[PDB]
Structure formats: structure tokens, C-alpha cells
Enzyme design. Sequence first.
Site, short mmCIF file in Angstrom:
data_model
loop_
_atom_site.label_atom_id
_atom_site.label_comp_id
_atom_site.label_asym_id
_atom_site.label_seq_id
_atom_site.Cartn_x
_atom_site.Cartn_y
_atom_site.Cartn_z
N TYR A 25 34.88 46.95 42.28
CA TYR A 25 35.89 47.46 41.18
C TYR A 25 36.08 48.67 42.02
O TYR A 25 37.28 49.55 41.91
CB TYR A 25 35.59 48.20 39.88
CG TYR A 25 35.69 47.44 38.74
CD1 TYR A 25 36.50 45.70 38.28
CD2 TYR A 25 35.87 47.90 37.34
CE1 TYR A 25 36.77 45.74 37.72
CE2 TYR A 25 35.67 47.01 35.69
CZ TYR A 25 36.68 46.47 36.22
OH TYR A 25 37.60 45.42 35.11
N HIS A 68 30.29 42.87 40.61
CA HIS A 68 31.41 43.33 39.93
C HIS A 68 31.55 44.89 39.90
O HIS A 68 32.69 45.04 40.36
CB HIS A 68 31.33 43.27 38.31
CG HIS A 68 32.13 43.33 37.64
ND1 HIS A 68 32.40 44.50 36.66
CD2 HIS A 68 33.94 42.84 37.37
CE1 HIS A 68 33.08 43.72 35.90
NE2 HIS A 68 34.63 43.19 36.63
N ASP A 69 30.77 46.24 40.22
CA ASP A 69 30.56 46.76 40.09
C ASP A 69 30.74 47.05 41.67
O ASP A 69 32.40 48.00 41.75
CB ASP A 69 29.74 47.74 39.67
CG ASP A 69 29.31 47.86 38.64
OD1 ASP A 69 29.44 47.48 37.57
OD2 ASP A 69 27.96 48.88 38.39
N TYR A 102 22.64 47.07 36.24
CA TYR A 102 24.40 48.03 36.79
C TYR A 102 25.12 47.70 36.07
O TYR A 102 25.99 47.88 35.63
CB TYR A 102 24.50 46.44 38.20
CG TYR A 102 23.75 47.02 39.10
CD1 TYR A 102 21.98 47.16 39.40
CD2 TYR A 102 24.92 48.17 40.06
CE1 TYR A 102 21.95 47.70 41.29
CE2 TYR A 102 24.71 48.43 41.23
CZ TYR A 102 22.86 48.49 41.77
OH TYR A 102 22.76 48.75 43.07
N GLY A 131 26.36 47.71 32.72
CA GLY A 131 26.81 48.96 31.78
C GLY A 131 27.29 50.44 32.83
O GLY A 131 27.62 49.68 33.65
N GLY A 149 27.65 53.59 35.44
CA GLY A 149 26.64 53.41 36.43
C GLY A 149 26.31 52.09 37.03
O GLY A 149 26.49 50.65 36.54
N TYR A 177 46.03 43.78 33.30
CA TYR A 177 46.96 42.20 34.07
C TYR A 177 47.42 41.35 33.16
O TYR A 177 46.20 41.44 32.35
CB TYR A 177 45.37 42.03 35.24
CG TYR A 177 44.16 41.35 34.58
CD1 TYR A 177 43.83 40.52 34.36
CD2 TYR A 177 43.24 42.43 34.38
CE1 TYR A 177 42.34 40.52 33.60
CE2 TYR A 177 42.15 42.41 34.13
CZ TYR A 177 41.68 40.93 33.57
OH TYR A 177 40.53 40.97 32.75
N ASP A 206 37.50 40.39 37.51
CA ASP A 206 36.97 39.80 36.33
C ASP A 206 36.26 38.39 36.12
O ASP A 206 35.34 38.12 34.78
CB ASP A 206 37.73 40.37 35.17
CG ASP A 206 37.74 41.79 35.12
OD1 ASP A 206 36.67 43.05 35.20
OD2 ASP A 206 38.76 42.26 34.37
CA LIG Z 1 28.33 49.15 36.09
#
Ligand SMILES: [Ca+2]
Length: 123
Positions: free
Chosen positions: A52, A48-49, A28, A30, A32, A73, A99
Site C-alpha cells: 500500500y 501488504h502494508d 501488522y 490491522g 498500523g 478496482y 490485495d
Molecule cells: Ca497493517
Amino acid sequence: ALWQFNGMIKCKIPSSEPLLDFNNYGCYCGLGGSGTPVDDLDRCCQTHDNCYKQAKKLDSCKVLVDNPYTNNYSYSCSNNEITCSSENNACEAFICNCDRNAAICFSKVPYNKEHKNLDKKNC
Ligand SMILES: [Ca+2]
């Protein structure tokens, strides 16, 4: 955006070069991300993915035609502590939180070198 995120990671892990260290790690971290996360750091990236993806469903972000990757931000780093700016609107604040949470997560889990540059067939 990427410039703020990179800065947040450096805030929590001063010895790191995030673009060299955390890019291309596990399934995960990076571009994709699919499959089962290989370890806890990979899980930070999975979360985190997902954060988003969620940001893209917020009404405030949608009306602003926002992109989590380019979101502008504001945040500050004081003594290795991250603070998302109070002036951020609802959408920017959400992304800033995604983030910040990831940066904190990265700083609390072990880094397993054998998972750097993983062939995605394992994902
Ligand atoms: Ca990712």
C-alpha cells in the site's frame, strides 16, 4: 477498498469472516504495523502494508489523487480463484494485485490463535 479485500479473502478461505478473523492479528494485520512480524501470517500483512505504501508512490495513483484504502478496482472470484479485472487502470490494477497477493498469502500460512489481539508492546 475494504469491501473488495474482504471478498478476496473469503474467495480463498471460504470458512472465514475476515473482519473477525484477520483484523487485530500480530503486529501488522490491522491498523498500523511496526516491529518484527510474529509469524508468517503477520509477514503476509507486513508485505501488504508495504504494498500500500508503494501504491502511494506510483505516478498513476498520485495524479488520480488515489487512496489505496478507498480504491474502487474490480475483481472476480471464480472457484476460489481471484481475477483482477483487465479494465482496471494502472493504479487500480496495482492495488488489486496487493490485495490478491495478500489473500493468497493468508490462505497458504498457518493461523496461530495465540497471536490474535497481541499487545503492541511486543511490536
Ligand atoms: Ca497493517
